[PDB]
Ligand binder design. Structure first.
Ligand code: NAG
Ligand code: NAG
Ligand code: NAG
Ligand code: NAG
Ligand code: NAG
Ligand code: UND
Ligand code: UND
Ligand code: UND
Ligand code: UND
Ligand code: UND
Ligand code: UND
Ligand code: UND
Ligand code: UND
Ligand code: UND
Ligand code: UND
Ligand code: D10
Ligand code: DD9
Ligand code: DD9
Ligand code: DD9
Ligand code: DD9
Ligand code: DD9
Ligand code: DD9
Ligand code: DD9
Ligand code: DD9
Ligand code: DD9
Ligand code: HP6
Ligand code: HP6
Ligand code: HP6
Ligand code: HP6
Ligand code: HEX
Ligand code: HEX
Ligand code: HEX
Ligand code: HEX
Ligand code: HEX
Ligand code: HEX
Ligand code: HEX
Ligand code: CL
Ligand code: CL
Lengths: 343, 334, 340, 339, 343
């Protein structure tokens, strides 16, 4: 049978087939149903704003010139070396940012021709696609990263890209991700870019990404709450214990600032304010204000001995009002923060 | 018909035969135009650099025939460059390099009537130079760009720097270094390998100096004022133990924390440095202040109470010793 | 007698051999026996979920078209240049994530053909495979990283992969790794992907990895116990040395805070709660509880009415033996739930 | 057929030469080249570089390629035959590295019109380099440029020129960390002068501004709070020696650890930045507060009540002196770096 | 006579020389005398367990088919472009872990053929070789990193590798390394591998490495000693200064803890305990025991009054015995540690 000789007879020098002429030339455009299969979705970074994927991109189209009827076998597998000399859609990724094929022990390409000219073309690609990311609400952000497929030399009247009806974009088994959770739902919006030359076909898929909260929650939020509670505790000690209260306040503020330093060391480097910087700043302001109010109490107390006992009663009243003002104000701030950053 | 003349000139020409095969050695003039001086990676001892390499020599076999005139220069394709003979020039100390292909093979070739050939190409070579990180904050580094032949001895190939302008760097703005002029000399630094004869080599030396403003303001002044605060505990009354112990111990803690945090920000090499000596001396001075307070306390605990005399001794002993050490340190490290 | 010419006569233009048709075409599937030889296992990162290996992948199969009888020698080595013109199985790793060959001074490939048609095809690859990591119990986890070998353009009725009878996956001499120790047992599991286009053959090997409990134990757990015992030391002092008690409590809580902060860089950058974070949070909570207990004691004692002082003494006596027992209960729950 | 029509128009059977510029030994061939920034970012202070993706395209007349027999208005081409046609030798003067994109096809395009005009659009990824000066780090404005220049042609053979309108364009609202790319971007006209003649040059400047919210908060606010805490230490009685010493030394330690923790996030540079000055001055103010407490303690103890009166007057005169000094420093620091 | 033409005549289509067959076929094994010349030894890393070198690998052997006497020139160079037409040994590195050649302005390969048939083949390579490292005694370790040269497809009876008689490995000039010093004497082990298929030739050269105790011995060690001495200073204080003693002890604890925390950034990322972790743990334990003994003496003293001054005398006795007991224990520990990790 010799399919290679049959392939040469069907297309080649003695066939008249041209590798640079699209099927149905000077006529209707040729639709290319392309469906992807994500195999490894990871390496999401904030410094360069990109992510890496592995795709089993397979695309199909009809070629009446390649259609045959004499050969008994329906499918004719074709090697990449001869695949170099067959017409293929000029597909490219609009935000590839860098990509390469895989050629381990064999080229990772597969082309088969059906009886009625249908062609299946599946290849393995690795892409460091780029998606802009916003960190206005860092610990509780929802991120969306997309990939776009477009023609490069064919307008809307020549090449058209359409997703499959069922299972256009699939995912592998229970692959994990650090600092992210890939949403099981991934809508497939349609695309179209109207350039100056004309209309180019384009399709995109959106991968919704959630962010984990346990580690950030514990390590950052909880010690801040404990330090703020200690700063509150600084109110219950006696007024005369000046070294004790000064040490407690200043050590709480040092603990807050070293927690902030550790966070900044372990946080993504971004110049605009995130949602955890607000929390750290507010906790620092709270402990600073507690130390300031202790200083005010001490100054009020000192002038009594240097009026009789009137100033002492005033200092006690300040302590009593503060011991209930601080927790309620902090609770109001916490309620507002969690309402505004969750709802 | 500029292609036909060069094709007929290269017909019956052997690319594997140097000009003057049995004659005098060929002379090659080398020119370098540095575009960008890459950042030095002190961890792996290397520095990238992007250069314009221009080497010119003479080839009698490439004499322009009298019938064809063209102009005073003739160009051969940067894709047909392999037809003519080219010197085997490589950088001795380099460890990673590549050409550049942005839109075309950016190699320039000129052939003149008299037989001279001009070759221009782009490279991004990551050379290597051993760096001495002793006296780290205020050191000075020198790095080489030795160009050396690989297959021909001095009897066949010779490299000489262009008399006018060997290197023409214009603007670099290094993040931690600075230079404007470099030693274009040492060009005749010839390396000889026994059993193979003399091998031609041309060397240019770049002198790199390190700016010390950030280290002077970021470490030295805070550490010095921390030592001053450590001294400050001498004037407090001896009875105020609960007020003088915290001052010294927190001064020591501040010094230790600053040293530990500055670690992993300095280059990660294991040998003594000027900054390390300064930090350990300041830590020792704080330690000595705390030990002096301990001696005062043990002396304190009719008793003569000869502890204020110890404080009077310390008030003039600590600043004087610190100033003497600082003078010695600067005089020996600068 | 001119082995190159003999091989050209055996297979080539004049012999009619085809390099795109599998042996035993339109018939029984051709078996492949491939045995891996790990040479360098390392570079395990929890950030990108990948690890790098070196492999002496050698795969054998029988090709009747390559059988010869006239040549006297039993074997016949082949240069890679003509190896590029012979049928080879398209064995691709299902999670290769990137790889490359080795071409140092020679192509690192070898192909020899026996008299009966059996051919050995040993090559050198440097894979960086990908394996998901489960870090719920970080310091005491047992990861399982695997590699998969599968065909690409052939189904189970044409190409079937299988390991050797013994010693399919082998390891080199006592190579070491940081933060892991490779288990001496590595089961050779069997896989098969039932795609819509048919059944593609699959073989996989599982490498068991256990994390060492060394540096982590000492310099992440011991200081926490020391700080908690220092907080108990703060418990062991009277209620009138208020500056001493306050300073001890605040300095212990600051020490716990800086101990937690410093280890943040060493630990992998992950956002779900690990076993180590639970321990650090519990120790911080213990220190906070000790300081709060002292605050309550001071409030009551600063609150004849010496019974209040008697009640403060009772609180101190209770907390003398309450915190150690609670810490022991926590330490007996934690290690039992995370190790057993 | 269009496929072999290219061979008929140029090639072995036509006599066209692919190594000779059009209008040979005549007027220079103008090349109207315009770029399209597709992805701007990856700016690093360690290597003084940035990375872009460019849809570089350029037109130039070609009477040799001009055709009139073929009815079709346009005539596309593939890279295989594109490798055998004259193209301008356009290289970036500060590329520092480049590579094409070859995913599923070569990312190149070339079509020829009837009049001879040729379009040539390619997709490139350039890791260009620009020197960035961080003298005023939190309030800097960078200026990074790219230089398109010829390599083997003078200004009498090849001349570049930006498009009359919309020469440099930007993609949708891409976001960078630590930088906001200004919408305005001027297009200067460089020209290098060498000893061998004049080489064409064109440059586009990308003005960059740095956001300062996170820097402002996480560095300036804690330092100001610690200074206020030092003033609180001022606002205490003289006899409270343990409390005052502890407060002063712990504020000093807090400033030192704040600076130490801040040194990791900031770029590693060897010259003084505008934030190092602020941190050093705040630390100096805390040290001065501790020194003032030491002086008042030495004067008060020492020893009639005039000495204690002198200490009280020292506290009275330093209670409001430090706030005025800090306000003056703040006003002279913000004026000099924002105006 | 053109040497290129002479070489084409000697090996070519009309020559009969086969480049795919070893010299002395079905005869004695061919010996290869190869010597390396290290040019840039460095970039040693502990995360990937590898190091990088630049080698002027030159290997010499004899090919009887290359014998010629008509040409009067003693030496006959060969262009690197036509290296495919001459038989070369398939030397490969068993633990190369990756490598590449150098092609700057010319292929960095040399080949000249002597009159009698001797062949020289010098190439420039850049190997990122890999060597396991043991860090049980980190600050005083002695690493042993090696490289192995082996044949790939040839057994022991066909290809034999032997080092040169003198100067088999030659280090370059005074290049330095970070955190290491390369010993000027290196042994030349005669490796060999015995696989099932037969014996494959193998030769290895071992590089002995010595760590420096400099920056380490200063920063990681001296501050810990100073903190311990400060703790003993805390010992030498009156028992009445309870706040002072508590503060001094807890701060020394804080200083040791932050020293241990900060030191980890520079230290290698290793799970098993090193020789410096023991020192840090012992110093922390010493400071903790100091604070514990202070707590004990304070509790004993407070038992008095709170039955005569015998309790005060007992507390004083605890101080007197601790003052001299603990420094001697520290000295004993120091001697044992340095003896066990240096002898
Ligand atoms: C080359 C060969 O014998 N392959 C065999 C095939 O004949 C058999 O049908 C199948 C099922 O046992 O196993 C395999
Ligand atoms: C070079 C040659 O053909 N003869 C060698 C001989 O030199 C060597 O002693 C022996 C063992 O190595 O192998 C044979
Ligand atoms: C799909 O392609 C065919 C030509 O192959 C064309 O006739 C038809 O109009 C196209 N329809 C779509 C879905 O665009
Ligand atoms: C350089 O030194 C060599 C001798 O080693 C020789 O070429 C000559 O004396 C010197 N000058 C030049 C231009 O070569
Ligand atoms: C290009 O510009 C030159 C002037 O520099 C002019 O002479 C010429 O006619 C213009 N057109 C072309 C493409 O030659
Ligand atoms: C949060 C700071 C409070 C400062 C003290 C305010 C006192 C107001 C009442 C004065 C009679
Ligand atoms: C920022 C320090 C504030 C100290 C207290 C000031 C009180 C002023 C009002 C007194 C009646
Ligand atoms: C945001 C912190 C508020 C602390 C309490 C302030 C009380 C001020 C009024 C006292 C009479
Ligand atoms: C490499 C020369 C080292 C000289 C000795 C330096 C000693 C520094 C510490 C002094 C206390
Ligand atoms: C306490 C004196 C500090 C200054 C010493 C200067 C020494 C001379 C330096 C010359 C560059
Ligand atoms: C911070 C050092 C202080 C030294 C003592 C100064 C005394 C000044 C007053 C003398 C009458
Ligand atoms: C750095 C603060 C200095 C404050 C003034 C001190 C004056 C001391 C002398 C008083 C007679
Ligand atoms: C329009 C720019 C304004 C910059 C800030 C000016 C601040 C002036 C007051 C400083 C105390
Ligand atoms: C903290 C170091 C103590 C050293 C010993 C001091 C002894 C002082 C008394 C001598 C009679
Ligand atoms: C870890 C230090 C132990 C010091 C000795 C304590 C003795 C307690 C019992 C006294 C009768
Ligand atoms: C500009 C960011 C606003 C975040 C939500 C509101 C926070 C209120 C804090 C009191
Ligand atoms: C998702 C957050 C879980 C936090 C658990 C804290 C347990 C403390 C003992
Ligand atoms: C103490 C305030 C808690 C607020 C929780 C909000 C949860 C929203 C889903
Ligand atoms: C450790 C420093 C001791 C200084 C003693 C000075 C004694 C002066 C009489
Ligand atoms: C009374 C003045 C004593 C000064 C001693 C100076 C010692 C310098 C080493
Ligand atoms: C851990 C804190 C316990 C507080 C108990 C207070 C009891 C008051 C009667
Ligand atoms: C999956 C979460 C387990 C949390 C266990 C907490 C045990 C506390 C003693
Ligand atoms: C009190 C903790 C005991 C932990 C025992 C662990 C045993 C593991 C085999
Ligand atoms: C933050 C401003 C404080 C102003 C204090 C003024 C005191 C005047 C006696
Ligand atoms: C490190 C152990 C403590 C020192 C021994 C003596 C302790 C007092 C009996
Ligand atoms: C700052 C040093 C002052 C010394 C005074 C000695 C009387
Ligand atoms: C009332 C004293 C004011 C001093 C101001 C110094 C800048
Ligand atoms: C360029 C120098 C600026 C000094 C500012 C001092 C506040
Ligand atoms: C190698 C010599 C070590 C001596 C140690 C003395 C403590
Ligand atoms: C949104 C800005 C908050 C600043 C708090 C100090
Ligand atoms: C008296 C209660 C005041 C609360 C302020 C938030
Ligand atoms: C070079 C600047 C030094 C500044 C010292 C305060
Ligand atoms: C440290 C010196 C002490 C001297 C006692 C007379
Ligand atoms: C850890 C010691 C506890 C003692 C209780 C009596
Ligand atoms: C974006 C401005 C933030 C200011 C916070 C004080
Ligand atoms: C804390 C120690 C108590 C010892 C009682 C005998
Ligand atoms: Cl304190
Ligand atoms: Cl820290």
């Amino acid at each position: 049978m010799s399919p290679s000789d049959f392939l040469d007879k069907l297309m080649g020098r003695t066939s008249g087939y041209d590798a640079r002429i699209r099927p149905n030339f000077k006529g209707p455009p040729v639709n290319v149903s392309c469906n992807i299969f994500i195999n490894s979705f990871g390496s999401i970074a904030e410094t360069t704003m990109d992510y890496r994927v592995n795709i089993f991109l397979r695309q199909q189209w009809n070629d009446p010139r390649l259609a045959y009827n004499e050969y008994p076998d329906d499918s004719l597998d074709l090697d990449p070396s001869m695949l170099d000399s067959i017409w293929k859609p000029d597909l490219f990724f609009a935000n590839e940012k860098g990509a390469h094929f895989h050629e381990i022990t064999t080229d990772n390409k597969l082309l088969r021709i059906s009886r009625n000219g249908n062609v299946l073309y599946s290849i393995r690609i690795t892409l460091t696609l780029a998606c802009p990311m916003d960190l206005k609400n860092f610990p509780m952000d929802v991120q969306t990263c997309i990939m776009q497929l477009e023609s490069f030399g064919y307008t809307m009247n020549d090449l058209i890209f359409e997703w499959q009806e069922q299972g256009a974009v699939q995912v592998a088994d229970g692959l994990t991700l650090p600092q992210f959770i890939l949403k099981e739902e991934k809508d497939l919006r349609y695309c179209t870019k109207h350039y100056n030359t004309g209309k180019f076909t384009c399709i995109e898929a959106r991968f919704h990404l959630e962010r984990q909260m346990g580690y950030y929650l514990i390590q950052m939020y909880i010690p801040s709450l404990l330090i703020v509670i200690l700063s509150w505790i600084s109110f219950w000690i006696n007024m005369d214990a000046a070294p004790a209260r000064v040490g407690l306040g200043i050590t709480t503020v040092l603990t807050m600032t070293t927690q902030s330093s550790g966070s900044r060391a372990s946080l993504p480097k971004v110049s605009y304010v995130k949602a955890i910087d607000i929390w750290m700043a507010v906790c620092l302001l709270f402990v600073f204000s507690a130390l300031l109010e202790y200083a005010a109490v001490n100054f009020v107390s000192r002038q009594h001995k240097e009026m009789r006992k009137l100033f002492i009663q005033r200092a006690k009243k300040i302590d009593k009002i503060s011991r209930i003002g601080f927790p309620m104000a902090f609770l109001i701030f916490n309620m507002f923060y969690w309402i505004i950053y969750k709802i | 018909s500029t292609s036909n003349i060069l094709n007929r000139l290269l017909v019956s020409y052997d690319p594997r035969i140097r000009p003057n095969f049995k004659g005098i050695p060929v002379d090659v003039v080398v020119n370098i135009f540095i575009n960008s001086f890459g950042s030095i990676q002190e961890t792996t001892m290397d520095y990238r650099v992007n250069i314009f390499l221009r080497q010119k020599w003479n080839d009698p076999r490439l004499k322009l025939p009298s019938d064809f005139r063209g102009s005073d220069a003739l160009t051969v394709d940067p894709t047909m460059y392999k037809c003519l003979w080219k010197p085997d020039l490589f950088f001795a100390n380099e460890k990673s390099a590549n050409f550049h292909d942005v839109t075309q093979e950016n190699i320039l070739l000129f052939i003149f009537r008299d037989g001279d050939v001009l070759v221009s190409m782009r490279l991004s070579i990551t050379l290597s130079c051993p760096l001495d990180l002793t006296l780290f904050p205020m050191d000075t580094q020198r790095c080489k760009m030795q160009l050396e032949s690989f297959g021909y001895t001095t009897d066949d190939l010779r490299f000489i720097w262009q008399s006018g302008d060997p290197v023409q760097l214009e603007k670099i703005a290094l993040p931690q270094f600075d230079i404007k002029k470099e030693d274009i000399e040492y060009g005749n630094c010839t390396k000889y390998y026994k059993g193979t004869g003399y091998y031609t080599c041309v060397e240019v030396i770049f002198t790199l100096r390190r700016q010390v403003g950030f280290y002077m303001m970021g470490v030295y002044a805070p550490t010095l004022l921390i030592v001053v605060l450590s001294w400050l505990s001498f004037w407090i009354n001896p009875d105020a133990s609960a007020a003088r112990v915290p001052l010294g111990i927190f001064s020591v803690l501040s010094l230790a924390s600053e040293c530990t945090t500055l670690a992993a920000e300095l280059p990660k090499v294991s040998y003594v440095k000027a900054l390390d000596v300064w930090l350990i001396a300041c830590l020792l001075f704080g330690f000595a202040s705390l030990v002096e307070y301990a001696v005062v306390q043990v002396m304190l605990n009719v008793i003569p109470t000869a502890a204020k005399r110890i404080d009077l001794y310390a008030r003039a002993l600590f600043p004087f010793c610190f100033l003497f050490f600082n003078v010695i340190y600067w005089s020996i490290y600068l």
